[PDB]
């Protein structure tokens, strides 16, 4: 679009990213900082540069999207930031959360690691033979 | 400046999104109803499949004196 | 006036795809494509219905009449109808039951006009059913029907060759 | 479980260890006591796809993930699209 | 590593486990790493991440071919001479059947060494050598025997260069990372100064030692070992000492000649190999120009230049990285070399340039299918490399925003087309054939596609066949025949014992063969089109280079995620091209035979090895074993107790061997783990198992032992079937 | 094919071909209802047989009959 | 009599295949080793890895001495 | 003669039942796949890494099998 252009992160064309369903369903996005005007990788394959705005680019799909990292952390920065956007607002709120780098301590969150019983002995095979009244629902 | 030509006619420009044709040919409501039964489709295709198909099939298949297979 | 448009991938940001080129979005083409269901919905699908069904009507002949399964006809009933008044027939609900995956069930009407539409968001959907229906009802009469200006067309016919 | 691949160990260190795995697994979250104290198996699963990345480094001394989850979205697997 | 570096020893590595990438083969015992080791023994991601080095390796260890193909050909000059037939089969040719080759009666042995020509007992050939050797401005079995150390002289030499590079301390960058001339040289004079060097030892001696020897006498009763010096006398029959001219230009006079030359085309009515009074010209008319051109020219410049609106701004600068690649300049190069050999196998069967070749039929045919097997297992390869670098080879990203940076902008495009292509093709250029049968076997042939039934009429002719064999009356010169004889216009009478080439006609039987090719050329193409493209992203992993263009799959997510990488597109592009050469080798003799060779006797009624049965017949790709598989082939299964019988007695082997490939291609890896230890346990109780910790194949190894298993399979059984239905009748 | 194919290879390329109707004129809006993609990862392994089987056993079915018909025997 | 002998000797051997994989899933799905052992089921499982061995140990030798006798005979 | 195809369909049944043997005697897991189970039968494919792991669901050795089964009756 036009009118309205806000843009951050150029490129130019591409075959690659966002079709038909990022509209009809979920939109994903990253976002991050830099310092002075640096030329990048991409996913989709294609590849351009950055100096800022928000820095914005939108992304297809979440797996696509921190890959700037997996060598988007080969080339400087502490700060890299997607979220997700719908076609209406929130509930799931992706990179914001508490702290960040998928290894420090806050809080404990879900995770568990265990199920009932532990790795031990599950020669132990299938118990109960699914029925509506003995804690297997997790 | 002449080869500064102020855009020899700027167009206005870009058309539009505007508008480069009228429209349909008058050409329409001289079908109103005219073959309705799927301009009554309300509640058909079942009927449309038992007559259609069988009589692309009765007839179809059968014949009075081969020219075989 | 430019090198190509004001130069662009898309008609904006360039991470959709597209890469508008031309063959997608030159005026040479995109004009010749929307007094139909090219960018705009004219009046409703009622009407485009036999145009579509009559167009790709008449075809479907020679294809099956010139290279028919015993070919080039002495009966008078092929130059033309003879069966494919099966083909239109095979898939004018090979059509209705795809628009059992459009519902969304109403009647407004608006295939008159009012203030300069958009239809909007006329991407995606903004069809339901009871437009689907006809559409594929103009294609019925299109196909069976469009078939015999083809047949009743005598034939003369060159080639050639 | 929907996705529920067993790559636990005993260290749960992850000090050139193991890290790679798109989103799925935000954890350090020291249990009470294992040595470079911090455990479990994962945290909230429901985001990403099937990796086994998941071990192919740092321990599961037993099994180490794969597909299993069956019930599966699309954000899921790539495509839906 | 780490061991001594320094500066403090000589002293060489021979002790200490392992070397290659660094919590390496690792104190603890492994049996993987021995294949690791062969496999990717040559590579560069290690050995150092500093070019430098790698064209010092490669320009020596290229060397040792050279050197080798050398000790090579030496074993075929010794053994074209002394284990002789040559010598015999030349002052009786149309007669012989040659060898060079012959057992030792150790024992079964023997039945492998079956009168051959000139006398006797041996094993036959299809590698035409005794035909290259025709040459021999001066014939002799002994001679062949200095040409033969010759060889090894080049070779020792030609081998001690290659201890005179790596090994020595070697040259540097500049002297490759400045190319600035290296094709200015190679084209200008060897590419020139061979075809030259080769015209001069091509009518000097050559020419005139089969000039009269297109005749008769029996040699030596020919061609002394120096006559052909100054003594410019018997070059005499065979054109002037230039009588009265004086070093080309024109203040010359004809009243009756022209110099050598005198253009032919055509074939020689008692040799049709094609004329050598032309052979000398058109090498002289070659190096010329190489002799002229290897004279560029120091190199951007000329690609930095010519771009356009959506062309390729890229272009300009396509790459600073072509000197500074090889995995690149190697992938290019393969397409040529490679689609530059099975260019050779065409011009060869409608154009032979060596006498006694059409009537030797078995021995240019082999040749049309080797030559033409590497003209495609050169060209998949020449799609690896490039892969290779797709993923890596540069440092960085320094290359950017150009021709590739462009043509990937699209990629789910490119290769979205040609997708459809195919399914296009397929759907017209293979069903078509199985309508056929459908509809033969529903018999109707009215309705068919023959030749004849679905509408064509007794004529393929008006195209450009037509204008070819017929062109000597445009700005054509001319000189009786054509260019190729096979050509629809004119002519007949080649050869007195069998027969050679003569129009080759065609419309349907050959219209959709020729189809098939599309479609199978094309398929084969989009796996490794979208294969080297796809190398590095995707939106299925973009995460996806990271390892190297290798990796077994990501894994059981994505659902897939198995396929993938780009070995694995250069593992299925094999297997297709496999077809693409096994299926367009299956056509040429099919034909070649069906018309073509055959034979002329009386009248010259014409008698093909098959009365063309191809006609309505092979469009019904049954009739592609009714006519063909078992039609022919009733040679190799006939073969028993023979001579030959070492393809029949192969054609069961490497036709088991293929059906071997499909459980090493079939089959999981866990699994023989799984199985490897019931072993491994059983091992232990007798105390006979554990150190060198035994393990499966290696996801990928696994595929490496089909593939090449499939088609050395797959493979030799034709080069059995073959040689089998050439020798004996054809 | 089911058998020296295995999924990775096939998904991808329809991530491709799944970017043409999208992006194609007279084919667009008309959406699937079920999200194109390619073969389970066990479902192939099947597939590839099940098919490698009938073939198989379809070919010694007419095989034996074509030839014990005729005879001679 | 020979289109009759075969489609009872396929099914037959494609049974027995379909006989030995319901008892690998009894194995998974239903089996109990608390309930079962020192119990002849078990033992069966427990002294496992001989028994693919003296099984292999069977092929192995069935196989290089078939074909020993099939080449060399060709 | 049928001294051999006689040790041939010998070298089948018994080749195609180490494969169901072991398929079998193992669903429940193993050395590279220890905790093989709740799902045992089909859950073809593991990740990559351990050795490299895969036809090693009993399914796919099942799987595995049909083809000797598919041999041997033939
Ligand atoms: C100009 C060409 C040429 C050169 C110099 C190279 C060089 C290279 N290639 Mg390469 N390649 C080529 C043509 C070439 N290739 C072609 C035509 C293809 C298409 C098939 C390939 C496909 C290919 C692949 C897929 C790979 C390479 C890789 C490599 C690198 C690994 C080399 C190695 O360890 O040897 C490898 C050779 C062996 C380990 C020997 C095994 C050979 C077996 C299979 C025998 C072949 C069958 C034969 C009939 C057996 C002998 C007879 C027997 C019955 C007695 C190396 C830089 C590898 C890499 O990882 O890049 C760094 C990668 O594996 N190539
Ligand atoms: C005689 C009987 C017998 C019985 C009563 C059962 C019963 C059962 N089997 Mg089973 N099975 C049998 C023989 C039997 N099996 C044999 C002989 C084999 C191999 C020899 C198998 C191999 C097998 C497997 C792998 C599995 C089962 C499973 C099952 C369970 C679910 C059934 C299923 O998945 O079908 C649903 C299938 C369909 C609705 C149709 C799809 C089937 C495809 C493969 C078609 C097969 C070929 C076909 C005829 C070719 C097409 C025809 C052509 C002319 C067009 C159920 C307990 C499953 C299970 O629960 O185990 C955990 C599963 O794993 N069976
Ligand atoms: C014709 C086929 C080919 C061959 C030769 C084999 C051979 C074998 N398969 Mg096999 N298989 C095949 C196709 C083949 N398979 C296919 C298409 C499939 C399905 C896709 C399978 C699925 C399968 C399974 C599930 C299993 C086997 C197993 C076996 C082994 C069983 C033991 C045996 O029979 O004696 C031993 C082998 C032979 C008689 C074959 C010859 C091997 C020697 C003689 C090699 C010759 C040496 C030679 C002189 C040196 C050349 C090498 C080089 C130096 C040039 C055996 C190695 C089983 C096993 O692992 O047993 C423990 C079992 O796991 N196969
Ligand atoms: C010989 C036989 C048979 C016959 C009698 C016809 C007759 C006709 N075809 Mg036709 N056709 C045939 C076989 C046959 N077709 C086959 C086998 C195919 C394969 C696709 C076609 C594909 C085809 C297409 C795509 C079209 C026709 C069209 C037409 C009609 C227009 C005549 C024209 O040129 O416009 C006259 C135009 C002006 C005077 C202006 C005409 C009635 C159409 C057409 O011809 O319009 C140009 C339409 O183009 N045909
Ligand atoms: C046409 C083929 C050919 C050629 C020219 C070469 C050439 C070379 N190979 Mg090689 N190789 C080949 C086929 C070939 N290989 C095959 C088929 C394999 C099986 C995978 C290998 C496996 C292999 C390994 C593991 C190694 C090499 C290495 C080398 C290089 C070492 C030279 C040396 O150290 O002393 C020369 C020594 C002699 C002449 C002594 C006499 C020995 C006998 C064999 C003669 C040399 C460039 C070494 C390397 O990395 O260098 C690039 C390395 O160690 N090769
Ligand atoms: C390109 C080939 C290579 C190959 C495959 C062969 C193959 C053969 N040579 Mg040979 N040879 C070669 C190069 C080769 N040679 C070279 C470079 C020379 C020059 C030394 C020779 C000199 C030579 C002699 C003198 C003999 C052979 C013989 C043979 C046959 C037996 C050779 C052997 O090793 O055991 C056996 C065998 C066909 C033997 C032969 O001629 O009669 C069968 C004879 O022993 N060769
Ligand atoms: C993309 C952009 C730009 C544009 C808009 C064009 C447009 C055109 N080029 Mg072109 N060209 C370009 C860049 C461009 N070129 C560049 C950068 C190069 C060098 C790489 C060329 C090299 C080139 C050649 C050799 C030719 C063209 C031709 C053409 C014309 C096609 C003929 C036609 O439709 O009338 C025909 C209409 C009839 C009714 C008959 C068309 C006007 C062709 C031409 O000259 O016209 C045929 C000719 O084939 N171009
Ligand atoms: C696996 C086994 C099998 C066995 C038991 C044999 C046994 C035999 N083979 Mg034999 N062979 C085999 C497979 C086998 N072969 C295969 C697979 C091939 C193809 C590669 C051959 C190709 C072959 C040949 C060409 C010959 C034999 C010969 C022989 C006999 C010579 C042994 C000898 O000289 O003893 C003497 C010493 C002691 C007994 C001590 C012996 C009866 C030789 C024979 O003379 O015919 C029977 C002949 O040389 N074999
Ligand atoms: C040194 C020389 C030389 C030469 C010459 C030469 C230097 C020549 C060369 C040539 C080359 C060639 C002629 C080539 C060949 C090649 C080949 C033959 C190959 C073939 C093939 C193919 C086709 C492919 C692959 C395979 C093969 C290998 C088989 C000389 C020098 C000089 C001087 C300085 C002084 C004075 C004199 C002179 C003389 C002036
Ligand atoms: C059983 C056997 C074998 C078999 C075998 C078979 C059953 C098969 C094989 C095969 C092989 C092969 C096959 C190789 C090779 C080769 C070659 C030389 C090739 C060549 C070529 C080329 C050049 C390219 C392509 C084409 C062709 C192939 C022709 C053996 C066994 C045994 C025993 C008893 C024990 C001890 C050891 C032995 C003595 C060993
Ligand atoms: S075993 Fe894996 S991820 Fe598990 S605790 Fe260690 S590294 Fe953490
Ligand atoms: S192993 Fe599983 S959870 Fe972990 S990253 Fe991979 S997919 Fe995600
Ligand atoms: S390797 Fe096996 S498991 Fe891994 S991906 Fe491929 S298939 Fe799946």
């Not at chain 3, 039951?97 to 008159?112: L, N, Q, T, V």
């Not at chain 5, 006498?217 to 120096?226: A, G, N, Q, R, Y």
């Not at chain 5, 065409?346 to 040749?367: G, I, K, R």
């Not at chain 5, 390869?381 to 940076?405: C, E, K, Q, S, W």
Request: proline share 5%; aromatic share 12%.
């Amino acid at each position: 679009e036009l009118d309205p252009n806000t843009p951050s992160p150029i490129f130019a064309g591409s075959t690659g990213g966002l079709l038909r369903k990022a509209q009809v369903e979920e939109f994903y996005v990253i976002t991050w900082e830099s310092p002075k005007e640096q030329i990048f990788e991409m996913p989709t394959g294609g590849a351009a540069i950055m100096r800022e705005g928000p820095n914005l680019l939108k992304l297809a799909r979440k797996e696509q999207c921190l890959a700037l990292g997996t060598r988007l952390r080969s080339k400087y920065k502490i700060k890299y930031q997607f979220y997700r956007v719908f076609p209406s607002g929130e509930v799931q709120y992706l990179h914001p959360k508490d702290g960040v780098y998928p290894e420090k301590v806050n809080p404990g969150r879900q995770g568990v690691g265990l199920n009932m019983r532990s790795i031990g002995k599950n020669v132990s095979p299938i118990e109960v033979k699914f029925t509506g009244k003995q804690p297997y629902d997790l | 400046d002449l080869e500064d030509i102020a855009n020899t006619t700027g167009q206005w420009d870009v058309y539009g999104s505007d508008a480069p044709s009228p429209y349909n040919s008058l050409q329409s409501k001289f079908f109103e109803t005219f073959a309705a039964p799927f301009t009554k489709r309300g509640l058909l295709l079942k009927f449309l499949i038992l007559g259609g198909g069988s009589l692309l099939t009765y007839v179809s298949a059968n014949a009075p004196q081969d020219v075989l297979p | 006036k430019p090198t190509y448009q004001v130069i662009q991938p898309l008609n904006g940001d360039p991470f959709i795809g597209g890469l508008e080129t031309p063959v997608t979005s030159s005026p040479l083409i995109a004009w010749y494509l929307s007094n139909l269901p090219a960018y705009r919905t004219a009046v409703n699908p009622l009407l485009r219905g036999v145009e579509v069904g009559l167009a790709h009507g008449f075809l479907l002949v020679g294809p099956f009449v010139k290279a028919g399964p015993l070919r080039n006809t002495e009966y008078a009933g092929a130059a033309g109808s003879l069966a494919a008044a099966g083909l239109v027939v095979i898939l004018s609900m090979c059509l209705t039951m795809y628009g059992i995956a459009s519902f969304k069930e109403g009647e407004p009407s608006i295939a008159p006009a009012l203030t300069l539409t958009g239809r909007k968001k006329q991407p995606d959907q903004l069809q339901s059913a009871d437009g689907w229906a006809k559409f594929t009802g103009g294609f019925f009469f299109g196909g069976v029907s469009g078939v015999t200006w083809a047949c009743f067309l005598m034939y003369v016919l060159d080639l050639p060759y | 479980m929907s996705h529920s691949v067993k790559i636990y160990d005993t260290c749960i260190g992850c000090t050139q260890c193991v890290r790679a795995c798109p989103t799925d697994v935000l954890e350090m979250i020291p249990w009470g006591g294992c040595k470079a104290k911090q455990i479990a198996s994962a945290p909230r699963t429901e985001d990403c796809v099937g990796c086994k990345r998941c071990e192919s480094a740092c321990p599961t001394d037993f099994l180490s993930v794969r597909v299993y989850l069956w019930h599966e979205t699309t954000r899921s697997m790539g495509l839906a699209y | 590593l780490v061991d001594r570096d320094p500066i403090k020893t000589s002293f060489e590595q021979w002790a200490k486990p392992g070397h290659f990438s660094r919590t390496i083969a690792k104190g603890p015992d492994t049996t993987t790493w021995i294949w690791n080791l062969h496999a990717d023994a040559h590579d560069f991601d290690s050995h150092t991440s500093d070019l430098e080095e790698i064209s010092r390796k490669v320009f020596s260890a290229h060397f040792g071919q050279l050197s080798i193909i050398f000790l090579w050909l030496s074993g075929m000059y010794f053994h074209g001479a002394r284990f002789s037939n040559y010598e015999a089969w030349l002052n009786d040719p149309t007669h012989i059947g040659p060898s060079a080759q012959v057992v030792w009666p150790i024992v079964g042995q023997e039945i492998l060494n079956g009168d051959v020509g000139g006398g006797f007992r041996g094993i036959q050939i299809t590698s035409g050598f005794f035909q290259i050797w025709r040459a021999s401005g001066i014939t002799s079995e002994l001679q062949l025997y200095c040409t033969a150390i010759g060889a090894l002289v080049f070779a020792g030499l030609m081998l001690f260069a290659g201890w005179f590079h790596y090994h020595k301390a070697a040259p540097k960058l500049a002297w490759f990372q400045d190319v600035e001339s290296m094709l200015n040289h190679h084209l200008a004079g060897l590419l020139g100064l061979g075809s030259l060097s080769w015209a001069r030892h091509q009518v000097h001696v050559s020419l005139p030692i089969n000039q009269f020897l297109n005749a008769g006498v029996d040699p030596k009763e020919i061609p002394l070992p120096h006559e052909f010096i100054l003594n410019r006398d018997l070059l005499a029959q065979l054109y002037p000492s230039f009588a009265e001219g004086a070093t080309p230009f024109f203040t010359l006079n004809w009243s009756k000649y022209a110099d050598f030359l005198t253009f032919r085309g055509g074939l020689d009515p008692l040799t049709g190999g094609l004329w050598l009074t032309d052979i000398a010209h058109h090498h002289l008319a070659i190096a010329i120009l190489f002799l002229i051109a290897g004279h560029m020219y120091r190199i951007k410049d000329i690609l930095e230049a010519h771009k356009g609106p959506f062309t390729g701004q890229g272009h300009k600068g396509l790459y600073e990285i072509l000197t500074t690649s090889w995995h690149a300049q190697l992938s290019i190069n393969l397409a040529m070399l490679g689609s530059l050999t099975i260019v050779v196998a065409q011009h060869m069967y409608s154009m032979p340039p060596y006498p006694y070749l059409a009537t030797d039929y078995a021995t240019q045919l082999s040749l049309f299918t080797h030559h033409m097997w590497i003209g495609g297992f050169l060209i998949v390869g020449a799609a690896a490399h490039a892969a290779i670098f797709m993923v890596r080879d540069y440092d960085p990203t320094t290359r950017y925003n150009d021709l590739l940076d462009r043509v990937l902008r699209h990629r789910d495009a490119i290769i979205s087309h040609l997708n459809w292509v195919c399914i296009f093709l397929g759907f017209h250029s293979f069903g078509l054939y199985i309508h056929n049968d459908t509809m033969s076997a529903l018999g109707r042939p009215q309705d068919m596609f023959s030749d004849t039934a679905i509408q064509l009429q007794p004529v393929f002719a008006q195209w450009i066949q037509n204008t070819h064999a017929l062109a000597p009356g445009t700005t054509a010169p001319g000189a009786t025949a054509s260019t190729s004889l096979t050509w629809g216009g004119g002519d007949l009478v080649a050869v007195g014992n069998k027969v050679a080439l003569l129009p080759i006609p065609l419309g349907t039987a050959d219209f959709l063969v020729h189809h098939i090719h599309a479609f199978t050329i094309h398929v084969t193409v989009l796996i490794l089109l979208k294969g080297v493209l796809f190398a590095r992203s995707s939106r299925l992993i973009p995460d996806k280079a990271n390892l190297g263009f290798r990796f077994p799959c990501d894994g059981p997510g994505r659902g897939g995620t198995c396929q993938v990488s780009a070995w694995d597109h250069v593992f299925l592009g094999l297997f297709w091209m496999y077809n693409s050469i096994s299926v367009v080798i299956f056509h040429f003799s099919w034909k070649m035979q069906s018309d073509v060779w055959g034979t002329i006797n009386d009248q010259g009624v014409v008698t093909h090895i098959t009365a063309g049965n191809f006609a309505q017949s092979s469009i019904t790709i049954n009739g592609w074993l009714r006519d063909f598989l078992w039609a022919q082939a009733s040679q190799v299964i006939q073969s028993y107790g023979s001579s030959l019988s070492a393809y029949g007695l192969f054609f069961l082997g490497a036709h088991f061997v293929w059906a071997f490939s499909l459980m090493f291609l079939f089959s999981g890896r866990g699994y023989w783990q799984e199985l490897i230890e019931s072993i491994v346990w059983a091992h232990n109780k007798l105390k006979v198992a554990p150190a060198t910790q035994p393990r499966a194949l290696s996801i990928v190894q696994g595929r490496a032992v089909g593939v090449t298993h499939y088609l050395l399979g797959g493979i030799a059984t034709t080069w059995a079937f073959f040689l089998a239905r050439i020798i004996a009748v054809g | 094919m089911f058998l020296i194919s295995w999924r990775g290879y096939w998904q991808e390329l329809i991530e491709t071909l799944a970017w043409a109707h999208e992006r194609t004129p007279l084919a667009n809006l008309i959406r699937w209802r079920d999200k194109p993609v390619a073969l389970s990862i066990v479902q192939a392994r099947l597939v590839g047989l099940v098919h490698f089987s009938v073939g198989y056993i379809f070919t010694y079915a007419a095989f034996l009959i074509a030839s014990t018909s005729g005879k001679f025997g | 009599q020979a289109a009759l002998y075969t489609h009872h000797q396929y099914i037959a051997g494609f049974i027995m295949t379909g006989a030995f994989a319901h008892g690998p899933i009894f194995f998974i799905r239903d089996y109990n080793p608390e309930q079962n052992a020192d119990n002849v089921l078990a033992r069966m499982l427990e002294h496992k890895e001989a028994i693919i061995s003296h099984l292999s140990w069977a092929s192995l030798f069935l196989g290089f001495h078939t074909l020993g006798l099939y080449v060399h005979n060709d | 003669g049928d001294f051999l195809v006689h040790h041939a369909i010998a070298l089948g049944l018994h080749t195609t039942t180490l494969i169901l043997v072991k398929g079998a005697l193992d669903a429940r897991g193993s050395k590279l796949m220890p905790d093989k189970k709740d799902f045992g039968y089909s859950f073809p494919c593991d990740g990559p890494g351990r050795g490299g792991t895969c036809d090693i669901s009993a399914w796919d050795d099942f799987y595995l099998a049909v083809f000797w089964m598919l041999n041997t009756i033939g």
